């Protein structure tokens, strides 16, 4: 047969992301002495919308504590932050919306966005529009804390990693239905070439393991095992269960 | 000495200057683009005659490696005249024509008479 499109996606010839008009990578502040021990404050200057990402971004200006300069950083904007606000980053910054401080100091039940998965990583978790994470419990020994991720999984992280306080701005974006293929086209044009999805059953057998036949039917179980070679691993990938959910 | 920056840069060392124990080449090459070899012959067409009579210019055909400064100096050397400005173009044949206008107190008719074109 022939190489299927899901298998062609790996080389990234025409499937690479469109990143010319993006405004930068949204990252937390780097770890240093000032925020490790005390705190520093930065001014919020602009709140920008970058292409391809639902959540807006904030441009925060800090001053270098080691030389005469001003360091500009791009954050994930939390709800309620306004331009000209003061945001404080550090170990002993008070707990209120906007500020970033380690999860080991906030009381349990705190709502957290742009969580940092490992110390120093500068923010990896709960950074999509309207998402957040919640501190569950602390372990004073071994320096670990338990958090609940937006997918519902509970994960244990080191308490020495920073995290923004609040919930990511731009919630409820999925509420509005795309009414037309035009809106869908404009949505995915700013992300990558993946939108007009063509069904496998509509294809030819040389092109897909489902294509062919005088009737449009899959012809074989849709659940494929996890250890199937690329070019065969299509359908429902190693499904524990299938069908309509009934209950939890 | 104490360090104030957390980076290490390569220290600047003494770079001694070339002194060759023998010249690479035996003798300096001869300038093959001199005044005689830079100008080939003057055009003697009706357009050239009209130009020399009207615009007080002299029309020459030079080689492709000559620039306006060299052309001006070569004309000054060969014909003992002053040059105002030079226009140049490369003909479709491959030769590079030159339009040489003279200072207002020289006469292009007299220069053409002495050079030998008329």
């Amino acid at each position: 047969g022939r190489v299927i499109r899901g298998q062609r996606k790996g080389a990234g010839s025409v499937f690479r992301a469109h990143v010319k008009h993006r405004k930068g990578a949204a990252r937390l502040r780097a770890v240093d002495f000032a925020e490790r021990h005390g705190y520093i404050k930065g001014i919020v200057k602009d709140i920008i919308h970058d292409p391809g990402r639902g959540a807006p971004l904030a441009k925060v200006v800090f001053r270098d504590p080691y030389r005469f300069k001003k360091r500009t950083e791009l954050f994930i904007a939390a709800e309620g932050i306004h331009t000209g606000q003061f945001v404080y980053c550090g170990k002993k910054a008070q707990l209120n919306i906007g500020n970033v401080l380690p999860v080991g100091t906030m009381p349990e039940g705190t709502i957290v966005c742009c969580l940092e998965e490992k110390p120093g990583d500068r923010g990896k978790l709960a950074r999509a529009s309207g998402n957040y994470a919640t501190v569950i419990s602390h372990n004073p020994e071994t320096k670990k804390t338990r958090v609940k991720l937006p997918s519902g999984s509970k994960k244990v992280i080191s308490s020495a990693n920073r995290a923004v306080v609040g919930v990511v701005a731009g919630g409820g974006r999925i509420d509005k239905p795309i009414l037309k293929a035009g809106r869908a086209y404009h949505k995915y044009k700013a992300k990558r070439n993946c939108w007009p999805r063509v069904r496998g059953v509509a294809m030819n057998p040389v092109e897909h393991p489902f294509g062919g036949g005088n009737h449009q039917h899959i012809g074989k179980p849709s659940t494929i095992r996890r250890d199937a070679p690329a070019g065969r691993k299509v359908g429902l990938i190693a499904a524990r269960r299938t069908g309509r959910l009934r209950g939890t | 000495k104490i360090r104030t920056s957390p980076t290490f840069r390569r220290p600047k060392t003494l770079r001694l200057r070339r002194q060759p124990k023998y010249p690479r080449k035996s003798a300096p090459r001869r300038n093959k683009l001199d005044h005689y070899a830079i100008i080939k012959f003057p055009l003697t067409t009706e357009s050239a005659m009209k130009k020399i009579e009207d615009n007080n210019t002299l029309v020459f055909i030079v080689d492709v490696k000559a620039n306006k400064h060299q052309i001006k100096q070569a004309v000054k050397k060969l014909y003992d005249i002053d040059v105002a400005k030079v226009n140049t173009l490369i003909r479709p044949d491959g030769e590079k024509k030159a339009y040489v206008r003279l200072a207002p107190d020289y006469d292009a008719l007299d220069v053409a008479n002495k050079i030998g074109i008329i």
Partner: protein, 226 residues
């Protein structure tokens, strides 16, 4: 004093005023060769060095080393210009004894040791393959000749007129130096030759880092308290 003159103190609190240019030599990103030549020493501290190599760390003390060098200064091999002068002098005398001298070189020293013609042996401690001389102390002990470890193959090679020498040996000395040599030999034999059992069974290395030992100390102190 002018009342205008007045101190303007600088407050280097967190996030208040720009930090001064203090010493940063402990946090510099050193080049790869420096990093390698320091981490090699760190690993030499870390790993359990076998006694065959650890024996070179226990070295002669400074006063005895100075006496050994000042005694050996009387027997440095002659220079090339001195040999040229001797050649001219001998030609002049012919047309008109071999004094004792240090024997340098690992092969010369080892053959003298196994033939029993060396009254003591001096060994360097930092030969960059240690295996050039790692066998030597056992050989010298078995043959009976005294041997010592001297800090610095460079200073050892200063005695000869060469950049570096691994080992040198005294084959014979003079009447005015017999007593000094004998005293030095007996001191060296007491320190090195007679201690060879615990030298041979003395393992090295196996020491942790300062932060590691500090936290272990904190843990054990807490345990001893409760």
């Amino acid at each position: 004093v002018n009342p205008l003159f007045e101190k303007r103190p600088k407050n280097f609190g967190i996030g208040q005023d720009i930090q001064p240019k203090r010493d940063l030599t402990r946090f510099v990103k050193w080049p790869r060769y420096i990093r390698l030549q320091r981490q090699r020493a760190i690993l030499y501290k870390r790993l359990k060095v076998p006694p065959a190599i650890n024996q070179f760390t226990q070295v002669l003390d400074r006063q005895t080393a100075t006496q050994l060098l000042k005694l050996a200064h009387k027997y440095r091999p002659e220079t090339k210009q001195e040999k040229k002068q001797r050649l001219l002098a001998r030609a002049e005398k012919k047309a008109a004894k071999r004094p004792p001298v240090l024997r340098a070189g690992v092969n010369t020293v080892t053959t003298l040791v196994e033939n029993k013609k060396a009254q003591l042996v001096v060994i360097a401690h930092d030969v960059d393959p240690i295996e050039l001389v790692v066998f030597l102390p056992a050989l010298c002990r078995k043959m009976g000749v005294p041997y010592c470890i001297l800090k610095g193959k460079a200073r050892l090679g200063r005695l000869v007129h060469r950049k570096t020498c691994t080992t040198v040996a005294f084959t014979q000395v003079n009447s005015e130096d017999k007593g000094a040599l004998a005293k030095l030999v007996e001191a060296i034999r007491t320190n090195y030759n007679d201690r060879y059992d615990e030298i041979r069974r003395h393992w090295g290395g196996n020491v942790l880092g300062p932060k590691s030992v500090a936290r272990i100390a904190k843990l054990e102190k807490a345990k001893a308290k409760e």
